[PDB]
Design a protein around this ligand. Structure first.
Ligand SMILES: CC(C)CN(C[C@@H](O)[C@H](Cc1ccccc1)NC(=O)O[C@H]1CO[C@H]2OCC[C@H]21)S(=O)(=O)c1ccc(N)cc1
Ligand SMILES: [Cl-]
Lengths: 99, 99
Protein backbone atom coordinates (compact mmCIF):
# COMPACT_ATOMS: atom_id res chain seq x y z
CA UNK A 1 0.00 0.00 0.00
CA UNK A 2 0.79 3.71 -0.12
CA UNK A 3 0.70 4.98 3.42
CA UNK A 4 0.21 8.70 4.06
CA UNK A 5 1.62 10.12 7.27
CA UNK A 6 -1.27 12.25 8.62
CA UNK A 7 -1.45 9.61 11.37
CA UNK A 8 1.20 7.31 12.74
CA UNK A 9 1.91 4.40 10.37
CA UNK A 10 0.87 1.71 12.81
CA UNK A 11 0.09 -1.65 11.19
CA UNK A 12 -0.82 -5.12 12.40
CA UNK A 13 1.92 -7.65 11.84
CA UNK A 14 2.73 -11.17 12.87
CA UNK A 15 6.06 -11.49 14.71
CA UNK A 16 7.21 -15.00 15.50
CA UNK A 17 3.60 -16.15 14.77
CA UNK A 18 2.11 -13.62 17.27
CA UNK A 19 -0.18 -10.82 16.12
CA UNK A 20 1.14 -7.45 17.27
CA UNK A 21 0.75 -3.84 16.20
CA UNK A 22 3.89 -1.87 15.33
CA UNK A 23 5.00 1.49 14.00
CA UNK A 24 6.70 1.45 10.58
CA UNK A 25 9.70 3.54 11.39
CA UNK A 26 12.19 4.70 8.76
CA UNK A 27 14.23 6.38 11.56
CA UNK A 28 14.85 3.03 13.30
CA UNK A 29 17.75 0.85 12.21
CA UNK A 30 16.37 -2.11 14.08
CA UNK A 31 12.99 -3.64 15.01
CA UNK A 32 12.15 -3.39 18.71
CA UNK A 33 9.19 -5.04 20.45
CA UNK A 34 8.22 -5.01 24.13
CA UNK A 35 7.34 -8.26 25.94
CA UNK A 36 7.53 -11.16 23.53
CA UNK A 37 9.31 -14.54 23.69
CA UNK A 38 10.85 -15.53 20.38
CA UNK A 39 12.66 -18.58 19.04
CA UNK A 40 16.29 -19.47 19.59
CA UNK A 41 18.99 -18.07 21.75
CA UNK A 42 19.15 -14.33 22.42
CA UNK A 43 22.15 -12.05 22.98
CA UNK A 44 22.11 -8.98 25.24
CA UNK A 45 22.62 -5.64 23.55
CA UNK A 46 22.13 -1.94 24.19
CA UNK A 47 20.53 0.57 21.83
CA UNK A 48 20.07 4.28 22.07
CA UNK A 49 17.32 6.61 21.05
CA UNK A 50 16.35 10.05 21.59
CA UNK A 51 16.34 9.89 25.39
CA UNK A 52 19.17 7.52 26.23
CA UNK A 53 19.88 3.78 26.14
CA UNK A 54 17.82 0.71 26.82
CA UNK A 55 18.87 -2.91 27.26
CA UNK A 56 17.42 -5.43 24.80
CA UNK A 57 17.50 -9.13 24.02
CA UNK A 58 18.56 -9.73 20.38
CA UNK A 59 16.94 -12.65 18.60
CA UNK A 60 18.11 -13.52 15.11
CA UNK A 61 16.07 -15.22 12.36
CA UNK A 62 12.60 -14.23 13.53
CA UNK A 63 9.85 -14.22 10.90
CA UNK A 64 7.69 -11.16 10.50
CA UNK A 65 4.60 -11.09 8.21
CA UNK A 66 3.47 -7.63 7.13
CA UNK A 67 0.25 -7.86 5.05
CA UNK A 68 1.42 -11.00 3.26
CA UNK A 69 5.09 -10.03 2.96
CA UNK A 70 7.35 -12.40 4.85
CA UNK A 71 10.82 -11.52 6.04
CA UNK A 72 13.22 -13.13 8.49
CA UNK A 73 15.65 -11.10 10.54
CA UNK A 74 16.68 -9.72 13.87
CA UNK A 75 14.24 -8.53 16.50
CA UNK A 76 15.24 -6.67 19.67
CA UNK A 77 13.09 -7.20 22.73
CA UNK A 78 13.08 -4.59 25.46
CA UNK A 79 11.23 -1.64 27.01
CA UNK A 80 10.52 0.45 23.96
CA UNK A 81 7.56 2.83 24.50
CA UNK A 82 5.88 1.51 21.31
CA UNK A 83 6.64 -1.45 19.07
CA UNK A 84 8.72 -0.42 16.06
CA UNK A 85 9.50 -2.04 12.71
CA UNK A 86 12.83 -0.69 11.56
CA UNK A 87 14.85 -0.65 8.36
CA UNK A 88 16.21 -4.18 8.82
CA UNK A 89 12.71 -5.46 7.99
CA UNK A 90 11.42 -2.53 5.88
CA UNK A 91 14.19 -3.25 3.33
CA UNK A 92 13.18 -6.90 3.09
CA UNK A 93 9.61 -6.02 2.08
CA UNK A 94 10.90 -3.43 -0.44
CA UNK A 95 9.48 -0.43 1.44
CA UNK A 96 10.44 3.02 0.19
CA UNK A 97 9.88 6.65 1.05
CA UNK A 98 8.38 8.54 -1.87
CA UNK A 99 7.75 12.21 -2.48
CA UNK B 1 12.35 10.56 -5.36
CA UNK B 2 11.91 7.00 -4.24
CA UNK B 3 14.25 6.38 -1.34
CA UNK B 4 15.18 2.83 -0.31
CA UNK B 5 16.08 2.06 3.27
CA UNK B 6 19.33 0.07 2.98
CA UNK B 7 21.02 3.11 4.55
CA UNK B 8 19.51 5.72 6.85
CA UNK B 9 17.36 8.17 4.81
CA UNK B 10 19.45 11.23 5.63
CA UNK B 11 18.89 14.21 3.33
CA UNK B 12 20.06 17.75 3.19
CA UNK B 13 17.40 20.35 4.06
CA UNK B 14 17.22 24.09 4.61
CA UNK B 15 15.72 24.86 8.07
CA UNK B 16 15.05 28.55 8.59
CA UNK B 17 18.14 30.18 7.17
CA UNK B 18 20.49 27.15 7.70
CA UNK B 19 21.42 24.09 5.62
CA UNK B 20 21.38 20.97 7.78
CA UNK B 21 21.18 17.21 7.27
CA UNK B 22 18.34 15.28 8.86
CA UNK B 23 16.86 11.79 8.97
CA UNK B 24 13.46 11.26 7.34
CA UNK B 25 11.62 9.59 10.16
CA UNK B 26 8.14 8.14 9.81
CA UNK B 27 8.27 7.07 13.50
CA UNK B 28 8.71 10.66 14.68
CA UNK B 29 5.57 12.81 15.14
CA UNK B 30 7.61 16.04 15.10
CA UNK B 31 10.82 17.40 13.69
CA UNK B 32 13.71 17.76 16.16
CA UNK B 33 17.00 19.51 15.51
CA UNK B 34 19.99 19.95 17.78
CA UNK B 35 21.50 23.44 18.19
CA UNK B 36 19.82 25.68 15.65
CA UNK B 37 19.03 29.36 15.90
CA UNK B 38 15.41 29.86 14.97
CA UNK B 39 13.52 33.08 15.04
CA UNK B 40 10.42 33.82 16.98
CA UNK B 41 9.00 32.90 20.31
CA UNK B 42 9.18 29.37 21.66
CA UNK B 43 7.62 27.31 24.47
CA UNK B 44 9.34 24.57 26.49
CA UNK B 45 8.07 20.95 25.96
CA UNK B 46 9.37 17.47 26.63
CA UNK B 47 9.28 14.68 24.16
CA UNK B 48 9.95 11.03 24.77
CA UNK B 49 11.57 8.26 22.85
CA UNK B 50 13.55 5.05 23.39
CA UNK B 51 15.52 5.72 26.56
CA UNK B 52 13.29 8.47 28.00
CA UNK B 53 12.58 12.15 27.65
CA UNK B 54 14.37 15.29 26.51
CA UNK B 55 13.46 18.95 26.98
CA UNK B 56 13.02 20.97 23.82
CA UNK B 57 12.11 24.45 22.67
CA UNK B 58 9.08 24.49 20.41
CA UNK B 59 9.14 26.97 17.51
CA UNK B 60 6.13 27.31 15.31
CA UNK B 61 5.97 28.53 11.73
CA UNK B 62 9.47 27.58 10.63
CA UNK B 63 10.11 27.24 6.92
CA UNK B 64 11.97 24.14 5.70
CA UNK B 65 12.92 23.33 2.13
CA UNK B 66 13.36 19.66 1.25
CA UNK B 67 14.57 19.18 -2.32
CA UNK B 68 12.53 22.08 -3.50
CA UNK B 69 9.44 21.15 -1.52
CA UNK B 70 8.74 24.05 0.82
CA UNK B 71 6.77 23.61 4.04
CA UNK B 72 6.06 25.61 7.16
CA UNK B 73 5.52 24.11 10.60
CA UNK B 74 6.82 23.29 14.01
CA UNK B 75 10.47 22.52 14.83
CA UNK B 76 11.61 21.27 18.23
CA UNK B 77 15.14 22.22 19.28
CA UNK B 78 16.93 20.07 21.79
CA UNK B 79 19.52 17.36 22.41
CA UNK B 80 18.43 14.75 19.93
CA UNK B 81 21.21 12.30 18.98
CA UNK B 82 20.58 13.03 15.26
CA UNK B 83 18.45 15.59 13.49
CA UNK B 84 15.08 14.16 12.43
CA UNK B 85 12.31 15.30 10.11
CA UNK B 86 9.05 13.92 11.44
CA UNK B 87 5.54 13.46 10.11
CA UNK B 88 4.54 17.07 10.69
CA UNK B 89 6.84 17.98 7.74
CA UNK B 90 6.73 14.69 5.85
CA UNK B 91 3.01 15.19 5.27
CA UNK B 92 3.59 18.77 4.06
CA UNK B 93 6.06 17.63 1.34
CA UNK B 94 3.78 14.85 0.20
CA UNK B 95 5.88 11.96 1.42
CA UNK B 96 4.43 8.47 1.70
CA UNK B 97 5.71 5.15 2.87
CA UNK B 98 5.13 2.52 0.19
CA UNK B 99 5.48 -1.27 -0.06
C1 LIG C 1 15.32 8.98 17.06
C2 LIG C 1 15.61 7.93 15.97
C3 LIG C 1 17.01 8.20 15.35
C4 LIG C 1 15.66 6.53 16.58
N1 LIG C 1 14.39 6.09 17.12
C5 LIG C 1 13.32 5.94 16.19
C6 LIG C 1 12.32 7.09 16.22
O1 LIG C 1 11.46 7.03 15.07
C7 LIG C 1 11.42 7.11 17.44
C8 LIG C 1 10.36 6.00 17.49
C9 LIG C 1 9.56 6.14 18.81
C10 LIG C 1 8.21 6.45 18.73
C11 LIG C 1 7.42 6.59 19.87
C12 LIG C 1 8.04 6.49 21.11
C13 LIG C 1 9.38 6.17 21.22
C14 LIG C 1 10.15 6.01 20.06
N2 LIG C 1 10.76 8.42 17.44
C15 LIG C 1 10.96 9.40 18.31
O2 LIG C 1 11.75 9.33 19.30
O3 LIG C 1 10.21 10.47 18.00
C16 LIG C 1 10.20 11.55 18.92
C17 LIG C 1 10.03 12.86 18.13
O4 LIG C 1 8.63 12.83 17.79
C18 LIG C 1 7.90 12.24 18.87
O5 LIG C 1 6.96 11.30 18.34
C19 LIG C 1 7.35 9.99 18.75
C20 LIG C 1 8.21 10.18 20.00
C21 LIG C 1 8.91 11.50 19.74
S1 LIG C 1 14.51 5.08 18.39
O6 LIG C 1 13.12 4.69 18.75
O7 LIG C 1 15.21 5.68 19.52
C22 LIG C 1 15.35 3.61 17.94
C23 LIG C 1 16.69 3.39 18.23
C24 LIG C 1 17.33 2.22 17.86
C25 LIG C 1 16.64 1.23 17.18
N3 LIG C 1 17.13 0.20 16.84
C26 LIG C 1 15.29 1.43 16.88
C27 LIG C 1 14.69 2.61 17.26
CL1 LIG D 1 23.79 19.25 9.82
Amino acid sequence: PQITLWQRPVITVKIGKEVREALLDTGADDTVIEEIQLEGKWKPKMIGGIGGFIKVRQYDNVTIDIQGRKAVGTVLVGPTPVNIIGRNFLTQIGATLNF
